[PDB]
Structures are given as C-alpha cells and as structure tokens.
Amino acid sequence: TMPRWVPLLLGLLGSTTCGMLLYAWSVFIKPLNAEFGWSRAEIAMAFAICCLIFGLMTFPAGRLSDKMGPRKVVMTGGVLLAIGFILSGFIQSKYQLYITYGVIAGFGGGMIYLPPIATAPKWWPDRRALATGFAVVGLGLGSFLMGPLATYIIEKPGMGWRYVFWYCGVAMGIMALIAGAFLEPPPAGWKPAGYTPKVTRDWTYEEAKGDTKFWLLYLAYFCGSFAGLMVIGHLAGFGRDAGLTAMAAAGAVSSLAFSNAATRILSGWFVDKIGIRVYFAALFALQTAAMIAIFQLGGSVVGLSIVAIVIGWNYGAMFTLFPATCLQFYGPTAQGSNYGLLFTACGLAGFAGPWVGGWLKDTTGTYYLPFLCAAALCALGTAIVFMTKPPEKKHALELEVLFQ
Ligand SMILES: Cc1ccccc1CCC(=O)O
C-alpha cells in the first residue's frame, strides 16, 4: 500500500504545526502590550499554560492513539487547536487568552504531536530513530515558518494580530487535518521490509509504567528539559551583559534554531547506526559543559554562537532520543502509551523551567545561579542516561506454549 516515507512526511507536517503553535506567543508579546496594559510576563503565562496542557495531553493522546488508532486522535487535535487559536483571535481578556491559546490550543497540540511519534518508527524498524526525528523536526522548523508569516499579517494595514490568530489558525487546522487524515500504522501482520522455541514480546503500558527504568528516563527527561528551558531564554541577555550590542547577541544566539532543528534528524540517523546510550549520555555531558563554559565563551559573538549551537544540538536531540530509547526498552506496540506518559515530564518542565530560571536570575542579579543549576541537572541526566541499560525482554509464554 502506501510508501513508508509518507508517514515521515506526515510527521513533518504535524510537528511543524505544533512548532508554529508554540512559537506564536512571542509574535503577540508586543501587539497585546500595545492594545492592553498586559506585561510580557502576563503574555508568557499564556505560553507556559500552553506547554503544561500540551505536555500533559500527550498521555491521553497516546493512550487513545493506541486504543483507537492515531488518525482520530490527530484530526481531533487539529479541531481543538484550530478552535483555540481562532478563538484567541476573538479574545478581549487575559483569561480568555489563557483558555483559548493556553488550554484549548495546547490540548489540540499535544494530540497532534504524539501519535506520529508513535506511528512513524512502526513503518521504519530498520531506522527507528530517524523516523522519530522526522516526527519531531517540525518543532524546530515552526519558528522559521511562522515568524515571517505572522510579521506579514501583523504589519499589513487591513489586518492585525487578531488576523494572525484567525488566518494562521485556519492554516494550522488544515495542515493537522491533512496530516492526521493519512496516518495509520502498517497493517496488523506483514511488516514493510526487504530484509529483517523462545518467544519475546513488547512491553504493555502497565508493564513499562511499572518499570523503574521508565522513571529513571522520566527523571532524566525532566532534568534535561528543565535545564534547557531555564537558560535558553537567557543566552542573549548573557551576551548583552558581557558587553555585546543587542543586535550582536541576538545574531549569535540565533544559531540555536538551526542546530535545534538539525540535531533532531541527524541524531536519529547517528544513533540508528551506532546505538543510543553512549551518544545520548555524551550529549547530556556536553550540555553540562556548555552551561559551565558560557562563563568563559559567552562574551563574544563567536563564543556565544558556539554555546548557542551546542545547547540547541543537545536540547533538540532529547526529543528524538527519549522516544527512541523508550522504543528500545519497551517496543513499538505500546509506544503510544509509554511515550505519551513519558512526555508529561516535558509538560511540567515547560511549565516551570523558564519561570524558575528568571527567578534565580532576578533573585541573585547574575547568571551564575540559573546556569549552575542547569549544569547540575544536566550532570544528573548524564549520570542517569549513561547508567540506564535496557530491561530484560519479555517472555510470551502464551505464544510460547503454542509450539506443540
Ligand atoms: C519542551 C516542550 C514542553 C511542552 C510542550 C512542547 C515542548 C516542545 C517539544 C519539542 O521541542 O519537540
């Protein structure tokens, strides 16, 4: 039936829509402050709520994708996201924005984001991590797609920021319905392949949810996620505090988008070829080193760029290597449920990380505390990821007894 790269194209579409949704809030920081007495932090609360609900709703989304297939889940997510974004177009208050953009749109975003991450590797057992990366690279691309689009709509005279919400919400609803329309696992028996009595079987959601290694991974995820979200918003300010012009710090930090996008594909390909654990742990360790190294490199465009690129490489790689690692531990059958649960760690990190980083800076007045804490979190993640080897594969005695 369908060529097994169509799933990859679909995951590219849906994750790109999710990246657009998660990028929009910065687009509206300044227009909403112009129209209302609304602080940057007041608008950032809408983004933090969005991250909380998105990361949380991956769990029901994965359970439902497993139970009734990914197509219904992704197209419902497209509906919810379209509704919440378009209604953000018609808002008048902060709580209306929190509800429409934060809760509704984030709900739809989690339901769009997860099912392709569980489905694409099913079409690609020879290349599971690369398939996963295609399911997530859209979160690195959504900024580049929306930035010019949202600027274009806002500055046009007959339009406005509410017009960004309305038009971009229709467009994202369409992309997500098109992505979810054509998404389904391979058929129940024959596996698309040219190549390939004890009997193993994949883990069940209840079996993985009870494994201690699942929760070590959850902890590592929370740590790496939290560290990145705590400092990335501070890189450019670190530069200007070091003496760079705002323009120069902004240019340097911008390389983070490129590496954040590239690592999602490239790291998938690498670990498909050489295994996950060692490359994975090395990325966390390098992330630890970068949190420290910024105090020596962050004062020049070249140094700040190196730190930004490295941070982006390690951060973005987490969202391919945690689903790939989970796939290796527990198998693809319950990957929807297993990884949906696991991503809630990111839901929580997304809610709290940026705020806590800002608070540590403003409490001390310096960057030492947030970056030092991020380094410690990444050191812990390094330890966990490096020490944690796959659990024992499961004997399936019910299948096993079928042999006379
Ligand atoms: C880190 C995070 C938290 C909550 C919701 C979304 C995301 C982004 C995930 C990605 O970059 O792939």
UniProtKB/Swiss-Prot annotation:
Mutation effect (residue 319 to A): Increases transport activity
UniProt-listed InterPro entries: MFS (IPR011701), MFS_dom (IPR020846), MFS_trans_sf (IPR036259), Proton-linked_MCT (IPR050327)
One matching Pfam family: MFS_1
Effect caused by changing residue 240 to A: No change in transport activity
Parts of the chain on the Cytoplasmic side: 69, 124-127, 182-211, 275-276, 331-334, 388-396
Phenotypic consequence of residue 240 to D: Increases transport activity
Residues engaged in binding (S)-lactate: 113, 264
Result of changing residue 22 to A: Loss of transport activity
TM annotation in the entry: 5-34, 40-68, 70-89, 94-123, 128-154, 162-181, 212-241, 246-274, 277-297, 301-330, 335-364, 367-387
Keywords assigned by UniProt, alphabetized: Cell inner membrane, Cell membrane, Membrane, Symport, Transmembrane, Transmembrane helix, Transport
Result of altering residue 260 to A: Loss of transport activity
Primary localisation category: membrane
Stretches in topological domain Periplasmic: 35-39, 90-93, 155-161, 242-245, 298-300, 365-366
Activity modulation comment: Inhibited by the protonophore carbonyl cyanide m-chlorophenylhydrazone (CCCP), but not by valinomycin.
GO CC term, one of those recorded: plasma membrane
Subcellular location per the Swiss-Prot or TrEMBL entry: Cell inner membrane
Membrane topology (UniProt): Multi-pass membrane protein
Superkingdom of origin: Bacteria
Gene3D superfamilies reported in the protein's UniProt record: MFS general substrate transporter like domains
One term of GO molecular function: symporter activity
Result of changing residue 264 to A: Abolishes L-lactate binding and L-lactate transport
Family: Belongs to the major facilitator superfamily. Monocarboxylate porter (TC 2.A.1.13) family.
Role this protein plays: Proton-coupled L-lactate specific transporter.
Protein's recorded name: L-lactate transporter
